[PDB]
Design a protein around this nucleic acid. Structure first.
Ligand SMILES: [Cl-]
Ligand SMILES: [Cl-]
Ligand SMILES: [Cl-]
Ligand SMILES: [Cl-]
Ligand SMILES: [Mn+2]
Ligand SMILES: [Mn+2]
Ligand SMILES: [Mn+2]
Ligand SMILES: [Mn+2]
Ligand SMILES: [Mn+2]
Ligand SMILES: [Mn+2]
Ligand SMILES: [Mn+2]
Ligand SMILES: [Mn+2]
Ligand SMILES: [Mn+2]
Ligand SMILES: [Mn+2]
Ligand SMILES: [Mn+2]
Ligand SMILES: [Mn+2]
Ligand SMILES: [Mn+2]
Ligand SMILES: [Mn+2]
Ligand SMILES: [Mn+2]
Ligand SMILES: [Mn+2]
Ligand SMILES: [Mn+2]
Lengths: 95, 97, 106, 82, 95, 106, 87, 97
DNA sequence: ATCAATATCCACCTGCAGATACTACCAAAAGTGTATTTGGAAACTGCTCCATCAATTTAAATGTTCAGCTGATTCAGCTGAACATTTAAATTGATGGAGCAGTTTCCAAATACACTTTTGGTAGTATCTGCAGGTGGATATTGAT
DNA sequence: ATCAATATCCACCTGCAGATACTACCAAAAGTGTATTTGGAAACTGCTCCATCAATTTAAATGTTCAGCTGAATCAGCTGAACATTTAAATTGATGGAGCAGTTTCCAAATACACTTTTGGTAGTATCTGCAGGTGGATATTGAT
């Protein structure tokens, strides 16, 4: 009866963009859902430490950005940062 | 009466099992082991089905990867046969010992 | 009445990401852009894995991504392999790999 | 015909796991060695999972108890919730 | 004029209880201060996740107790549990 | 006008520990027994290492504990060694331990 | 500053006897000639990884001085927790 | 003149350094190395002198314990001499490579 | 080289376990309007960190000699692989009931906020002491013969 | 078993870097005391999904026969250890200068909090369909001769 929240629909949206004619099994989707949660937790935890280390009350996109650089391997970090910034610029420049 | 050389069927099994993903221990005997071990921590436990499966995916992944390291240890000693001393070395370097 | 996801140009839910950051005890305050930024990264990494996993499905003559394709995607990629170096993908199996000293004497 | 539960993890099954791990040739003593290692692995993870169960005041070990236990043991498992 | 807290004075009290005639170097004390901070964060970290896992918004002595059992090895866990339970029981009844 | 530590029978600071649990953002709420229990654990653990380390100093004819004694305490004790299995104690050195095969003769 | 010095090849400042002393403490009785360059390469990798994370905390804090805490947090990040330097 | 046999002075050295706790690498050279590497990440950095000492304590402990693992790898191959291949097995089993 | 035993491959087929799709709420976003909270900016002056040089101390490099370790080589015995045949256990599919989880209740306990008191940190000199690093010299351990 | 060379142990002695000692101290917390808000324990319950048990398909154990791997043995060539002497770097303790953290105070911009509307997201339920696994036949690999 309770609602069980999941990244499933958004993972699926992203799958359609990248491989419009490719589906995905239940089990694979559950794997992708663990992946998103784990990465969320890792980035959020690092961002949290950074704030506390610097005696700051707030997690801002800057903490996220430094968190991404500490956590992601070289090239992965580079493109993640640019996606992050891209999305923030787009979002701010919205009337 | 055709017969394969020692090692030919082993190599074939490697290729066969490296290609597949199914669990390689039968389910029931694994379930019994799990239940026996949990009983020593708390009696009269039940287990969700997916809890036993989780433990099995994990345990089998752990053992496969340990068998890889063990193999590198045997090969380091110029052997092709894994021995308990290879497992022991792998575990000691991992900091499991 | 427009979602912050659409405003940021994302598939991933900026709103949900915001909530999860608040109720996760990560810090007292969470800034406006942090969830947008984090959502973007999560979307990005999802796309990265799904692309390569999709490719592995294709090569194996399949249209549905199963766990095996995710494992092949991740472990044949140096960077994804490293990020997930201590993760186990259920039903993933392993990469085919036989040490050359074990091969029969050709 | 008693025989302990650990012996239910058969030589052939251990042989199969070794094959997936790329092993060609296996000493006779490996099978007992491997059973011992699996028991220690299971003890370590189950103890932690049971500890989550008892904390939640439950009589059933959930997949999430196991997932959480694996994570804190540095063996993150994907595909079972969380 | 800067301020910085440490557990130095409490470590020294305990030391005086166990070894009345034994001092401690300033570098040893620094190690002891790192030790306490490190074990604080680990237990509090485990206690945090434990609450989150159970949808609790409160960390109580029952979470601290489960975190001690997860974190400490066998014999140290047993004895830390007693000492903690003992101090909580006494704290309630002394007041 | 009583300290919570004296009430609990502790040398370790209950007030301080409560506050650090607040500042660390571990949960929205912190119960009154939480910092008492945790202060007790921290005190017990430091008593356990200081006892062994004081003994190590004495075995080495010294009145003053140095990091070397701290490291002998930890690594000679199974459980403390495991608790600190991934920790480096500065200026601790290692335990004397030479493998058998390296010794002379037969 | 009348100038600024150029740092090159400083890894060779880690001499063969220094590396031998570390092996002795590690319990090593006999050492092959190629160990010294192998160890230099392992140490350089280790320092790059840790220095990289330490410098990232420094820049994040908008500082130009790498603090002991920057190093301690970096070591902790890598599961190499160090005691005796502020955490 | 008197001569100790090969291996005798090496064993003496093991006992001596296993007994002591001082850093075995000179301070100035290790500091230049840290400076050089870090300059390559970011120009114009200063270091608290304890930041450099923390890096040296961590580095030497990393290397001592790697040599222990390497030693076990050599001995596993029925040798007493450590070789680059011992270090590489150790780091592979550790998950460093 | 040939010859045959068996493993492996590809094409095709098909029903059903497991996908996708359609729907009807509604929990939780988004919107809207005060209500705090924060963390540069600018302006402090004040140490650490960096540079240099001289004197002194410690370590590295080199040259030379050869002990003994590594790696090659070879081989025989034993042990593990392969496989046929005999034996046992797991998988599968079918049904009560434990207990997880959903809901509604309320009080014990936790937050909040506002004076009141005290303990912890440091700063300034003050006093002192454990032990490092220098000396004995008596007690080992190693290696030549 | 004997001698002698060189290392090691341990002893006492004594300057001092570093540790313990106030004294002021002050102030930043920790405590105390009502006053407000609520989390979660409790008890009741309904219904998933867990354990037990009686159906077939799947694997494990066992015996036997021998290929080929491991471990033992032997040895030469040469690497790496030991050590005297020479050569080079680091250490230590000066001093000074600038460059950067670090303590402090302002409010403009930012995020919290609260409350009111308006979905996108989910569970349920209702279709659609990749592909697992089966069969057939062609040809590849392996291994005997
Ligand atoms: Cl932000
Ligand atoms: Cl063995
Ligand atoms: Cl409590
Ligand atoms: Cl090599
Ligand atoms: Mn110039
Ligand atoms: Mn450079
Ligand atoms: Mn064909
Ligand atoms: Mn169905
Ligand atoms: Mn033979
Ligand atoms: Mn023989
Ligand atoms: Mn046999
Ligand atoms: Mn019931
Ligand atoms: Mn005081
Ligand atoms: Mn001395
Ligand atoms: Mn003398
Ligand atoms: Mn409520
Ligand atoms: Mn051999
Ligand atoms: Mn040579
Ligand atoms: Mn809608
Ligand atoms: Mn098929
Ligand atoms: Mn056929």
């Amino acid at each position: 009866k309770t609602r069980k929240e999941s990244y499933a629909i958004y993972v699926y949206k992203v799958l359609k963009q990248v491989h419009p004619d490719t589906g995905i099994s239940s089990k694979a989707m559950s794997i992708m859902n663990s992946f998103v949660n784990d990465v969320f937790e890792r980035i959020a935890g690092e961002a949290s430490r950074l704030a506390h280390y610097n005696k700051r009350s707030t997690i801002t996109s800057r903490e996220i950005q430094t968190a991404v650089r500490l956590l992601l391997p070289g090239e992965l970090a580079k493109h993640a940062v640019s996606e992050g910034t891209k999305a923030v610029t787009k979002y701010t420049s919205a009337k | 009466p055709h017969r394969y050389r020692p090692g030919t069927v082993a190599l074939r099994e490697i290729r066969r099992y490296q290609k597949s993903t199914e669990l390689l221990i039968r389910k029931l005997p694994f379930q019994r082991l799990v239940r026996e071990i949990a009983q020593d921590f708390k009696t009269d436990l039940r287990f969700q089905s997916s809890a036993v499966m989780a433990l099995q995916e994990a345990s089998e992944a752990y053992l496969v990867a340990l068998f890889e390291d063990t193999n590198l240890c045997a090969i380091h000693a110029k052997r092709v046969t894994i021995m308990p001393k290879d497992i022991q070395l792998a575990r000691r370097i991992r900091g499991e010992r | 009445a427009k979602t912050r996801s659409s405003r940021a140009g994302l598939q991933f839910p900026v709103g949900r990401v915001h909530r999860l950051l608040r109720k996760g005890n990560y810090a007292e305050r969470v800034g406006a852009g942090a969830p947008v930024y984090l959502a973007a990264v999560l979307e990005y990494l999802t796309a990265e894995i799904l692309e390569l996993a999709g490719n592995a499905a294709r090569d194996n003559k399949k249209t549905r991504i199963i766990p095996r394709h995710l494992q092949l995607a991740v472990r044949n990629d140096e960077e994804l392999n490293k990020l997930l170096g201590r993760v186990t993908i259920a039903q993933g199996g392993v990469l085919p790999n036989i040490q050359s000293v074990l091969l029969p004497k050709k | 015909v008693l025989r302990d539960n650990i012996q239910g993890i058969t030589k052939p099954a251990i042989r199969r796991l070794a094959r997936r791990g790329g092993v060609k040739r296996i000493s006779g003593l490996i099978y007992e060695e491997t059973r011992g290692v699996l028991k220690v692995f299971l003890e370590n993870v189950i103890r932690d999972a049971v500890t989550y169960t008892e904390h939640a005041k439950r009589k059933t070990v959930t997949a999430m108890d196991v997932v959480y236990a694996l994570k804190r043991q540095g063996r993150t498992l994907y595909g079972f919730g969380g």
